[PDB]
Design a binder for these strands. Structure first.
Ligand code: FES
Ligand SMILES: [K+]
Ligand SMILES: [K+]
Ligand SMILES: [K+]
Ligand SMILES: [K+]
Ligand SMILES: [Mg+2]
Ligand SMILES: [Mg+2]
Ligand SMILES: [Mg+2]
Ligand SMILES: [Mg+2]
Ligand SMILES: [Mg+2]
Ligand SMILES: [Mg+2]
Ligand SMILES: [Mg+2]
Ligand SMILES: [Mg+2]
Ligand SMILES: [Mg+2]
Ligand SMILES: [Mg+2]
Ligand SMILES: [Mg+2]
Ligand SMILES: [Mg+2]
Ligand SMILES: [Mg+2]
Ligand SMILES: [Mg+2]
Ligand SMILES: [Mg+2]
Ligand SMILES: [Mg+2]
Ligand SMILES: [Mg+2]
Ligand SMILES: [Zn+2]
Lengths: 38, 43, 101, 18, 122, 38, 222
RNA sequence: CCCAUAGUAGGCCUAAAAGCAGCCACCAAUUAAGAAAGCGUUCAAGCUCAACACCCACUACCUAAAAAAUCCCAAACAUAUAA
RNA sequence: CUCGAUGUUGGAUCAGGACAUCCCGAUGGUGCAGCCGCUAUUAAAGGUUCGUUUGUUCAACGAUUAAAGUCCUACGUGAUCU
RNA sequence: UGGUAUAUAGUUUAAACAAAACGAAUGAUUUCGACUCAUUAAAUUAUGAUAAUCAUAUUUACCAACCA
């Protein structure tokens, strides 16, 4: 992913989800929008 | 780990001191006395 | 309509919806028909028919689905929501489609 | 090491007059 | 710079809701004080240490009686955070010559002229 | 020592730190929460 | 039947001839020769100037004290002039250009040897002052985006406001002081020198009332 | 969540400028929908948004991190009436 | 702090440790077809060359390697040496 | 790595609103040429802001540096 302290969606298909104790951003359309909470 | 640079309670980077609950009450107890002192010094 | 259009009515042969408008338990069936009768779903399979026969016999509503394989699916919508009817409808599409191919 | 400049201001050493 | 403090006058103005809390009477003010030091003069300015000597408050928790007049009150406003002020009450009145040796100052602020040291029969 | 104005938050004297802790806003609390009431 | 609402009309608003922000020079026209003391009390305490709106309706409020050099003015200027519509907006400066000289000694020199040479100039700012004021045929939601973006890059705590939010901020703080259930306040104690507390306080604490600590402002303090 | 027809490719500029390089206007059909808010096309196409319908998404808009070198560092505890 | 003495460059010898990973391991993204690479997450068990000139640390150069890592340890270590 | 200087016709070189010089062309001149004179063509490292001045990175020049 890319570690981010301020998560932000970059398109309509990005969705927030809390996993392993921290927030993530996943995107099936554009996998480069993926972010990990730092 | 956990060094306080220099001496603890002086200088720029000091060891943090936190206010307990009884420390608050002890100060409030003193205030209530001196607030009643103002009343008797007014007549 | 969107969720059902991505799938497509490929295996389906005919769909029949009967309901009694004056009865007070046909909102579910009428909502099911509102989506299946959309241009997005109907376009995926022109051969697949969609028929609506209105009745006023005081009878319960049902959805009868004819497949190409010959199997049939019936959903009595008196105590079923549109989402429940649509969901079950989609699951059968996926199963029957895989069986044919 | 590196030498530094001096102050250019002189005087100002008068004492109070009371 | 650290200096002496000027206490505003409005601080020493009892409100109506203050008289129904401490039990005082603005029309009939009390005549004498009962001052008692409850704080150390160490770590305080020298001008506070001198006032404590003028008022005879060297030893702590030792009741001393002073007059409720402006000049005395002024000295008290400088060390009002080192002392406890309480009015002197006289339920039996002023001690007579025959009672000087029978008195006792209670914690309530009352001066009783008959210290019998015996259970009340009531 | 340190000046009165600093780029960093300067540690208070313990007497002041205690004062700031006693003189904290206390919001009113109604006996019954307004949501529980009609 | 989704209920529609009337909309405000800005036809009555006028736009100047140079709505964009003018350029700020690094140093004043004539360079200064007399070197000045640090005078840190120019950013300490509440501001007594530029605390109210004059022409516009939206602005950037300073929530703390600091010094502004040229690098800050360029960021504000470019960022605002790029993101704003010159036709329906206008902006003005609420702060003067850098005038306070900042001396600095050369690298490697030891303590002493006089005073340093003038290096750059700054503009002192106190808490509660307006830095930039905007206005025109626009709502607040439009400018609030890039104004907060600007406020975050400033060396002090800042925030975008409007004539309404600023007023509401001030009325809510007064409401807190009135309904505060705590019988003990910083003002009452300090002014009366209760507990000998003025031995650890400052003379400014009589007026700041605990809401300021150096250059930092604490809005949650009553 | 849902849904999208039309005067018209508005005018001018432009090799071309079609809701979306610029300037001017920003009127109008249909119960309902900006002479277009965000992508996109060499220009067009194409995907969304604001609209109608349906009926209750009937939200929050107040704060976002952390790493050094001999070996972490009292042990432990959320519920029996402020002493 | 130490001048009634805390022996100071580099090297030899023996290495302890950190991870901000040079190689080997596990993963996400890519303007990742593949072979090579860029970037980030995780991982410190194991390992991290021989030589010419220079007192050198560095640096250049030659030949190699899966890689020839960055740092601290009184610029680790002279009652062990040089 | 560090800062300090750096840029102008095709080249060469004062200065930025573009000056001169070599070479080029053109005539004037000579029996024909050289020389000379006159004329003509010909440029500002490129990027972002002030509006033509500061920045931006390049560009090549210029000195600095383990230590005992
Ligand atoms: S508890 Fe009273 S409203 Fe939920
Ligand atoms: K310290
Ligand atoms: K900031
Ligand atoms: K166009
Ligand atoms: K020594
Ligand atoms: Mg220490
Ligand atoms: Mg003098
Ligand atoms: Mg003198
Ligand atoms: Mg000081
Ligand atoms: Mg046209
Ligand atoms: Mg157009
Ligand atoms: Mg279109
Ligand atoms: Mg376009
Ligand atoms: Mg149109
Ligand atoms: Mg427009
Ligand atoms: Mg919509
Ligand atoms: Mg010795
Ligand atoms: Mg790691
Ligand atoms: Mg290792
Ligand atoms: Mg050593
Ligand atoms: Mg030896
Ligand atoms: Mg040794
Ligand atoms: Zn995405």
């Amino acid at each position: 992913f890319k570690n981010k302290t301020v998560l932000k969606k970059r398109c309509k298909d990005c969705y927030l989800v809390k996993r392993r104790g921290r927030w993530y951003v996943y995107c099936k359309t554009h996998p480069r929008h993926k972010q990990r909470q730092m | 780990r956990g060094r306080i640079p220099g001496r603890q309670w002086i200088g720029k980077h000091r060891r943090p001191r936190f206010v307990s609950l009884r420390a608050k009450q002890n100060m409030i107890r003193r205030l209530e006395i001196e607030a009643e002192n103002h009343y008797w010094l007014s007549m | 309509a969107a969720a059902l259009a991505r799938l497509g009515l490929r295996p389906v042969k005919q769909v029949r919806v009967q309901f009694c408008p004056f009865e007070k338990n046909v909102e579910s069936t009428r909502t099911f028909l509102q989506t299946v009768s959309s241009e997005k779903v109907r376009s995926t399979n022109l051969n697949c028919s969609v028929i609506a026969d209105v009745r006023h016999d005081g009878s319960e509503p049902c959805v009868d689905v004819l497949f190409g394989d010959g199997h049939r699916l019936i959903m009595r919508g008196a105590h079923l929501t549109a989402l429940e009817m649509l969901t079950a409808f989609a699951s059968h599409i996926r199963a029957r489609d895989a069986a044919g191919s | 090491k590196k030498s530094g400049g001096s102050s250019k201001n002189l005087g100002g050493k008068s004492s109070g007059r009371r | 710079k650290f200096t002496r403090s000027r206490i505003p006058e409005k601080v020493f103005q009892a409100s109506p809701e203050d008289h129904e809390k401490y039990g005082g009477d603005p029309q009939n003010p009390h005549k004498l004080h009962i001052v008692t030091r409850i704080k150390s003069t160490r770590r305080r300015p020298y001008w506070e240490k001198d006032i404590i000597k003028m008022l005879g408050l060297e030893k702590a928790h030792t009741p001393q009686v002073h007059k409720n007049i402006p000049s005395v009150n002024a000295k008290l406003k400088v060390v009002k955070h080192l002392i406890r002020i309480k009015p002197l009450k006289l339920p039996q009145g002023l001690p007579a010559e025959e009672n000087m040796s029978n008195t006792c100052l209670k914690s309530t602020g009352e001066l009783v002229v008959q210290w019998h040291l015996k259970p009340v029969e009531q | 020592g340190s000046k009165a104005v600093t780029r960093h938050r300067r540690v208070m004297h313990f007497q002041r730190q205690k004062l700031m802790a006693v003189t904290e806003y206390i919001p009113p609390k109604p006996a019954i929460h307004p949501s529980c009431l009609p | 039947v989704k209920t529609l609402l009337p909309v405000p009309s800005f036809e009555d608003v006028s736009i100047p001839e140079k709505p964009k922000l003018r350029f700020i020079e690094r140093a004043p026209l004539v360079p200064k020769v007399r070197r000045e003391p640090k005078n840190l009390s120019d950013i300490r305490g509440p501001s007594t100037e530029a605390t109210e709106f004059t022409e516009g309706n939206f602005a950037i409020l300073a929530l703390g004290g600091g010094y502004l050099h040229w690098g800050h003015f360029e960021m504000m200027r470019l960022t605002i002039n790029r993101s704003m519509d010159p036709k329906n907006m206008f902006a003005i400066w609420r702060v003067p250009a850098p005038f306070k000289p900042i001396t600095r000694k050369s690298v490697g020199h030891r303590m002493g040897g006089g005073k340093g040479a003038i290096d750059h100039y700054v503009t002192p700012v106190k808490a509660g002052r307006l830095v930039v004021e905007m206005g025109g045929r626009c709502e607040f939601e439009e400018v609030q985006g890039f104004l907060d973006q600007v406020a975050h890059k400033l060396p002090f705590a800042a925030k975008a406001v409007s004539r309404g939010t600023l007023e509401k901020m001030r009325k809510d703080q007064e409401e807190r002081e009135r309904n505060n259930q705590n019988p003990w306040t910083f003002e009452r104690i300090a002014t009366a020198n209760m507990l000998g507390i003025r031995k650890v306080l400052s003379p400014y604490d009589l007026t700041h009332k605990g809401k300021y600590w150096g250059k930092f402002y604490m809005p949650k303090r009553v």
